[PDB]
Protein backbone atom coordinates (compact mmCIF):
# COMPACT_ATOMS: atom_id res chain seq x y z
CA UNK A 1 0.00 0.00 0.00
CA UNK A 2 2.78 2.43 0.94
CA UNK A 3 4.43 2.14 -2.46
CA UNK A 4 1.17 2.69 -4.33
CA UNK A 5 0.89 6.17 -2.84
CA UNK A 6 1.27 9.32 -4.93
CA UNK A 7 3.47 12.10 -3.56
CA UNK A 8 0.42 14.18 -2.60
CA UNK A 9 -1.18 11.17 -0.89
CA UNK A 10 2.05 10.53 1.01
CA UNK A 11 2.06 14.14 2.22
CA UNK A 12 -1.63 14.11 3.15
CA UNK A 13 -1.13 10.83 5.05
CA UNK A 14 1.84 12.13 7.03
CA UNK A 15 0.17 15.45 7.83
CA UNK A 16 -2.96 13.75 9.11
CA UNK A 17 -0.90 11.44 11.33
CA UNK A 18 0.74 14.35 13.18
CA UNK A 19 0.65 13.97 16.96
CA UNK A 20 -0.94 16.79 18.99
CA UNK A 21 1.13 19.36 20.88
CA UNK A 22 1.08 18.31 24.53
CA UNK A 23 1.19 20.62 27.57
CA UNK A 24 3.63 20.27 30.45
CA UNK A 25 2.63 20.27 34.11
CA UNK A 26 4.79 23.37 34.60
CA UNK A 27 3.66 25.34 37.63
CA UNK A 28 5.15 28.82 36.97
CA UNK A 29 4.96 29.57 40.69
CA UNK A 30 7.28 26.66 41.51
CA UNK A 31 10.93 27.78 41.54
CA UNK A 32 13.02 25.63 39.19
CA UNK A 33 15.49 23.06 40.42
CA UNK A 34 17.56 20.49 38.54
CA UNK A 35 15.17 17.82 39.79
CA UNK A 36 11.94 19.59 38.80
CA UNK A 37 13.13 20.62 35.36
CA UNK A 38 14.29 17.08 34.62
CA UNK A 39 10.96 15.97 36.09
CA UNK A 40 9.02 18.24 33.72
CA UNK A 41 10.92 17.18 30.61
CA UNK A 42 10.64 13.49 31.51
CA UNK A 43 6.92 13.74 32.30
CA UNK A 44 6.33 15.50 28.98
CA UNK A 45 8.50 13.14 26.95
CA UNK A 46 6.75 10.13 28.51
CA UNK A 47 3.31 11.33 27.40
CA UNK A 48 4.68 12.20 23.93
CA UNK A 49 6.04 8.67 23.47
CA UNK A 50 2.54 7.18 23.63
CA UNK A 51 1.48 9.53 20.84
CA UNK A 52 4.68 8.77 18.93
CA UNK A 53 4.01 5.05 18.98
CA UNK A 54 0.55 5.53 17.52
CA UNK A 55 1.97 8.05 15.03
CA UNK A 56 4.57 5.55 13.80
CA UNK A 57 1.82 3.03 13.03
CA UNK A 58 0.39 5.60 10.60
CA UNK A 59 3.67 6.12 8.78
CA UNK A 60 3.22 4.39 5.41
CA UNK A 61 5.13 1.12 5.32
CA UNK A 62 5.80 0.95 9.06
CA UNK A 63 3.11 -1.63 9.93
CA UNK A 64 4.33 -3.83 7.06
CA UNK A 65 7.30 -4.53 9.30
CA UNK A 66 7.50 -7.30 11.89
CA UNK A 67 6.72 -6.23 15.44
CA UNK A 68 10.32 -6.81 16.44
CA UNK A 69 11.52 -4.58 13.60
CA UNK A 70 9.04 -1.88 14.67
CA UNK A 71 10.33 -2.10 18.25
CA UNK A 72 13.93 -1.71 17.10
CA UNK A 73 13.30 1.36 14.91
CA UNK A 74 11.45 3.22 17.67
CA UNK A 75 14.08 2.24 20.25
CA UNK A 76 16.77 3.69 17.99
CA UNK A 77 14.91 6.80 16.88
CA UNK A 78 12.69 7.92 19.78
CA UNK A 79 14.86 10.81 21.08
CA UNK A 80 15.77 11.95 17.55
CA UNK A 81 12.05 12.13 16.88
CA UNK A 82 11.26 14.01 20.09
CA UNK A 83 14.10 16.41 19.31
CA UNK A 84 13.15 17.16 15.70
CA UNK A 85 9.61 17.75 16.95
CA UNK A 86 10.98 20.11 19.58
CA UNK A 87 13.16 21.96 17.07
CA UNK A 88 10.18 22.30 14.73
CA UNK A 89 7.89 23.76 17.43
CA UNK A 90 10.63 26.24 18.37
CA UNK A 91 11.31 27.66 14.87
CA UNK A 92 9.38 30.88 15.37
CA UNK A 93 10.80 31.36 18.87
CA UNK A 94 14.43 32.48 18.43
CA UNK A 95 16.57 31.78 21.47
CA UNK A 96 13.94 29.57 23.08
CA UNK A 97 12.91 25.94 23.04
CA UNK A 98 9.15 25.34 23.10
CA UNK A 99 8.97 22.04 24.94
CA UNK A 100 5.27 22.82 25.34
CA UNK A 101 3.14 25.91 24.79
CA UNK A 102 3.39 26.57 28.53
CA UNK A 103 7.04 25.50 28.76
CA UNK A 104 9.27 27.81 26.76
CA UNK A 105 12.88 27.59 27.98
CA UNK A 106 15.98 29.61 27.08
CA UNK A 107 19.62 28.53 27.44
CA UNK A 108 19.89 30.30 30.79
CA UNK A 109 17.18 28.06 32.20
CA UNK A 110 18.97 25.12 30.61
CA UNK A 111 21.83 25.78 33.02
CA UNK A 112 19.47 24.71 35.83
CA UNK A 113 20.54 21.18 34.88
CA UNK A 114 24.24 20.31 34.95
CA UNK A 115 25.49 19.62 31.44
CA UNK A 116 22.19 20.30 29.66
CA UNK A 117 22.93 23.77 28.31
CA UNK A 118 25.39 22.36 25.78
CA UNK A 119 22.54 20.28 24.38
CA UNK A 120 20.10 23.22 24.52
CA UNK A 121 22.62 25.21 22.46
CA UNK A 122 22.76 22.51 19.76
CA UNK A 123 18.96 22.29 19.63
CA UNK A 124 18.65 26.06 19.41
CA UNK A 125 21.15 26.12 16.55
CA UNK A 126 19.14 23.48 14.65
CA UNK A 127 16.00 25.55 15.20
CA UNK A 128 17.92 28.53 13.77
CA UNK A 129 18.90 26.46 10.76
CA UNK A 130 15.27 25.42 10.16
CA UNK A 131 14.24 29.07 10.39
CA UNK A 132 16.97 30.20 7.98
CA UNK A 133 15.93 27.45 5.56
CA UNK A 134 12.25 28.30 5.94
CA UNK A 135 11.48 24.63 6.57
CA UNK A 136 7.93 23.80 5.53
CA UNK A 137 5.52 21.62 7.52
CA UNK A 138 5.34 19.16 4.63
CA UNK A 139 9.15 18.85 4.53
CA UNK A 140 9.23 18.42 8.33
CA UNK A 141 6.83 15.45 8.41
CA UNK A 142 8.85 13.79 5.62
CA UNK A 143 12.07 14.30 7.60
CA UNK A 144 10.55 12.93 10.79
CA UNK A 145 9.36 9.82 8.92
CA UNK A 146 12.81 9.40 7.36
CA UNK A 147 14.32 9.36 10.87
CA UNK A 148 11.93 6.64 12.03
CA UNK A 149 12.76 4.37 9.08
CA UNK A 150 16.47 5.16 8.75
CA UNK A 151 18.00 5.48 12.19
CA UNK A 152 17.86 1.80 13.13
CA UNK A 153 18.01 0.21 9.68
CA UNK A 154 21.67 -0.85 10.01
CA UNK A 155 21.46 -2.33 13.50
CA UNK A 156 18.87 -5.07 12.92
CA UNK A 157 19.91 -8.64 13.73
CA UNK A 158 17.02 -14.35 6.70
CA UNK A 159 14.24 -11.97 5.56
CA UNK A 160 16.04 -8.70 4.70
CA UNK A 161 13.27 -7.98 2.17
CA UNK A 162 12.03 -6.25 5.29
CA UNK A 163 15.03 -3.93 5.06
CA UNK A 164 14.62 -3.79 1.29
CA UNK A 165 11.03 -2.76 1.88
CA UNK A 166 12.20 -0.01 4.25
CA UNK A 167 14.63 1.27 1.63
CA UNK A 168 11.86 1.41 -0.99
CA UNK A 169 9.64 3.43 1.35
CA UNK A 170 12.59 5.69 2.10
CA UNK A 171 12.97 6.23 -1.68
CA UNK A 172 9.28 7.12 -2.00
CA UNK A 173 9.75 9.76 0.73
CA UNK A 174 12.72 11.18 -1.21
CA UNK A 175 10.43 11.28 -4.27
CA UNK A 176 7.90 13.16 -2.16
CA UNK A 177 10.42 15.77 -0.90
CA UNK A 178 11.53 16.51 -4.47
CA UNK A 179 7.87 16.75 -5.49
CA UNK A 180 7.18 19.34 -2.80
CA UNK A 181 10.21 21.37 -3.90
CA UNK A 182 9.35 21.20 -7.60
CA UNK A 183 5.84 22.35 -6.71
CA UNK A 184 7.33 25.27 -4.75
CA UNK A 185 9.01 26.38 -7.98
CA UNK A 186 12.61 25.40 -7.21
CA UNK A 187 14.84 24.57 -10.18
CA UNK A 188 16.26 21.03 -10.49
CA UNK A 189 19.57 22.28 -9.11
CA UNK A 190 17.84 23.99 -6.21
CA UNK A 191 15.83 20.82 -5.54
CA UNK A 192 18.89 18.58 -5.14
CA UNK A 193 20.67 21.21 -3.07
CA UNK A 194 17.74 21.61 -0.66
CA UNK A 195 17.24 17.86 -0.42
CA UNK A 196 20.88 17.55 0.61
CA UNK A 197 20.64 20.46 3.05
CA UNK A 198 17.65 18.82 4.77
CA UNK A 199 19.16 15.34 5.00
CA UNK A 200 22.46 16.69 6.35
CA UNK A 201 20.54 18.16 9.30
CA UNK A 202 19.61 14.57 10.21
CA UNK A 203 23.30 13.96 11.00
CA UNK A 204 23.18 16.76 13.56
CA UNK A 205 19.92 15.45 14.96
CA UNK A 206 21.59 12.02 15.37
CA UNK A 207 24.48 13.76 17.14
CA UNK A 208 22.16 15.56 19.56
CA UNK A 209 20.27 12.34 20.31
CA UNK A 210 23.55 10.56 21.03
CA UNK A 211 24.67 13.31 23.40
CA UNK A 212 21.17 13.51 24.88
CA UNK A 213 21.08 9.77 25.53
CA UNK A 214 24.37 9.91 27.41
CA UNK A 215 23.15 12.83 29.49
CA UNK A 216 19.90 11.00 30.27
CA UNK A 217 21.86 7.96 31.38
CA UNK A 218 23.90 10.07 33.80
CA UNK A 219 20.62 11.43 35.21
CA UNK A 220 19.33 7.92 35.90
CA UNK A 221 22.60 7.01 37.62
CA UNK A 222 22.71 10.17 39.75
CA UNK A 223 19.10 9.52 40.86
CA UNK A 224 18.26 13.11 39.92
CA UNK A 225 14.99 12.25 38.21
CA UNK A 226 12.99 9.03 38.31
CA UNK A 227 12.38 8.03 34.69
CA UNK A 228 9.13 6.35 33.66
CA UNK A 229 8.91 2.62 32.95
CA UNK A 230 8.70 3.18 29.19
CA UNK A 231 11.54 5.70 29.16
CA UNK A 232 13.71 3.36 31.20
CA UNK A 233 13.20 0.63 28.62
CA UNK A 234 13.80 3.00 25.70
CA UNK A 235 17.01 4.21 27.35
CA UNK A 236 18.24 0.68 28.13
CA UNK A 237 17.85 -0.19 24.44
CA UNK A 238 20.89 1.98 23.63
CA UNK A 239 23.17 0.04 25.97
Amino acid sequence: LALSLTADQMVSALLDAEPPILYSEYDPTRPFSEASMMGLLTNLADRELVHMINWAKRVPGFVDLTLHDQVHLLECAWLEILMIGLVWRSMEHPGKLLFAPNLLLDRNQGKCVEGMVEIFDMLLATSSRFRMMNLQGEEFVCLKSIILLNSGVYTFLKSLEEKDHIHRVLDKITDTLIHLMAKAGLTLQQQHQRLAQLLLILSHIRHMSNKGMEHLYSMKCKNVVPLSDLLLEMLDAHR
Binding site: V50, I53, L67, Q70, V71, L74, D229, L230, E233, M234
Partner: peptide, 10 residues
Protein backbone atom coordinates in the same frame (compact mmCIF):
# COMPACT_ATOMS: atom_id res chain seq x y z
CA UNK B 1 6.89 -8.47 25.79
CA UNK B 2 8.36 -5.13 26.82
CA UNK B 3 6.14 -2.06 27.08
CA UNK B 4 6.94 -0.74 23.62
CA UNK B 5 6.10 -4.10 22.07
CA UNK B 6 2.74 -4.23 23.88
CA UNK B 7 1.79 -0.68 22.87
CA UNK B 8 2.78 -1.47 19.29
CA UNK B 9 0.40 -4.42 19.56
CA UNK B 10 -2.34 -2.44 21.33
Amino acid sequence: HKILHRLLQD
